[PDB]
Structure formats: C-alpha cells, structure tokens
C-alpha cells in the first residue's frame, strides 16, 4: 500500500516496520513531563511536525497507542494511556490529517516492549506509538 | 541560516541558490490553469505540500514572487502577478504558515528568465517563484 517515497520519509523519520506496521514510540517523559495528558509545548510542535512531514507526502491515516508500565492500578493506566494518544492525535489533527483517518487506541499496560522490572523498561514502557500501517 | 537538512528539503524541491535566496519557479499555468488569481483544486494541494515539507524543517519565512510574461498591459500583468503570488500565500497561511514571515510581491514582466519570443519561453515567464531567504 506505501509508496517507496512514503517508506523513506517513514525510515528517515525513525520507524521501523513492525506487525501493525511502521511504527515509532516516543517518550512519555518527553510528551507529557510531569503533566497527565497535556503534552509539553515543545512536544506539541515536536509531533506536529512529524505529522506535516507525513502529511507532505500524502501519508494521511495513523493509529496512535497509548502505553503505560504496569505500576499503578490497571484501569487508571489504560484511560491515562487512552488520554495521551488521544493529545497526540488532537495535534495531528490540528496540523491537517482527517480526523476520519486517525485511530486512537489506549493499550494501558498491555503490550509491553521492554520488562517493566528495570526502571529503564518500565521507561520504555511508558510511551505513545504512532504507526503508520503498510496496507 | 539554513542547516544541512533543511536545505536538503529546498534541493528536493528544485530550489536553486539565487540572488534572492534558494528559489524554485511553479509554472502559472500548472498553478492556475485558465483561471486567472484561483488556483487549480489539485495545485492548491501541491502547495499544501511544499508549505508542509517546509514546515516540518522549521522553514517558517517564504517569500513568494508572481511574474508574468511580456503580452498584454505592463500595469495589468504587474497586478495579475501580485494577485497570484498572494493566492500562493493563502494557501502557504492556511497550511500553518505563519503570515507575518510570507513577503508577497508581483514583478509583472520585470524579471524574465526566458526570451519572450516563443510561447514554451513567454511559459517559462509566466510563473510564481517560492524563494527561501538564506
């Protein structure tokens, strides 16, 4: 489905082509800092940027998810987590993607990439994907 | 001014280093078709892309320039021009360009790049130049 100019700008941004397809994780840390689900306002122009960088060769559908660690209650960190991908996707929209064509997921502590008994993997752990699928 | 990557994005474009700045030319009659300032549905969409492609390299201050070949009134085509160029800034504002950094101007038929003599060169004229400021 991913044209080859659309597969460079998606290597050079960083994401690596995974199950869901092309995929790249970015920092809770970096997005949020101490907030909940505000993001940090040089994130926010962090993420809008990718998004025009996307949108520049007509990528034009994403799948946000949402991730936490698995410290803290289990229902609190899948809203959080449903909460901080939806952030992301507000901005998305506002840099010009379809709202139509942008899916929203919180996966709370779920789907780990690292073992959440390191603080540096429960780290991440903590994290919103945005992912571009291959179809 | 312009970092590696960021001019990496202007040579992706076309952009040649001009006396102005780096400057690529899109062709009126691509932009603009039998219309007169309105731009063609698909070419304000090419443009939302190059605003875009500039935007995400932090490339937030255009100037855009609107030239005309030499037929007709000088005073006509000097105005056409501008309205040209600034139906390019529209489109540049709406994409997230900040309007303060986007310099607008109609040169009419004061700044050839080809002999007016032929149509593929009066073509040629009939252009709006994106111009980066380095």
Same mark, same amino acid.
């Given at each position: 489905?991913?044209?080859?100019e659309?597969? $460079?700008v +998606?290597?050079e941004?960083?994401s690596?082509l /995974?199950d =869901? @397809?092309?995929?790249?994780?970015?920092?809770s840390k970096?997005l949020?800092?101490?907030?909940?689900?505000?993001?940090?306002?040089?994130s926010?122009?962090?993420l809008?940027k990718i998004?025009? $960088?996307? +949108?520049?060769?007509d990528?034009?559908?994403? /799948?946000? =998810? @949402?991730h936490?660690?698995?410290?803290?209650?289990?229902?609190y960190?899948?809203?959080?987590?449903?909460?901080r991908?939806?952030?992301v996707?507000?901005?998305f929209?506002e840099?010009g993607?379809?709202?139509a064509?942008?899916?929203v997921?919180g996966?709370?502590?779920?789907?780990?990439?690292?073992?959440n008994k390191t603080?540096?993997?429960?780290?991440?752990n903590?994290?919103?994907?945005?992912?571009?699928p291959?179809?």
């Amino acid at each position: 489905g991913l044209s080859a100019e659309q597969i $460079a700008v +998606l290597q050079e941004q960083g994401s690596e082509l /995974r199950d =869901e @397809g092309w995929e790249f994780g970015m920092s809770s840390k970096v997005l949020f800092g101490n907030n909940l689900d505000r993001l940090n306002p040089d994130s926010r122009n962090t993420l809008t940027k990718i998004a025009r $960088a996307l +949108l520049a060769v007509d990528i034009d559908k994403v /799948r946000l =998810e @949402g991730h936490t660690d698995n410290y803290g209650d289990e229902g609190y960190n899948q809203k959080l987590s449903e909460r901080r991908a939806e952030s992301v996707a507000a901005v998305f929209r506002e840099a010009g993607m379809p709202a139509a064509n942008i899916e929203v997921r919180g996966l709370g502590m779920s789907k780990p990439v690292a073992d959440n008994k390191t603080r540096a993997g429960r780290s991440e752990n903590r994290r919103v994907a945005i992912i571009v699928p291959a179809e």
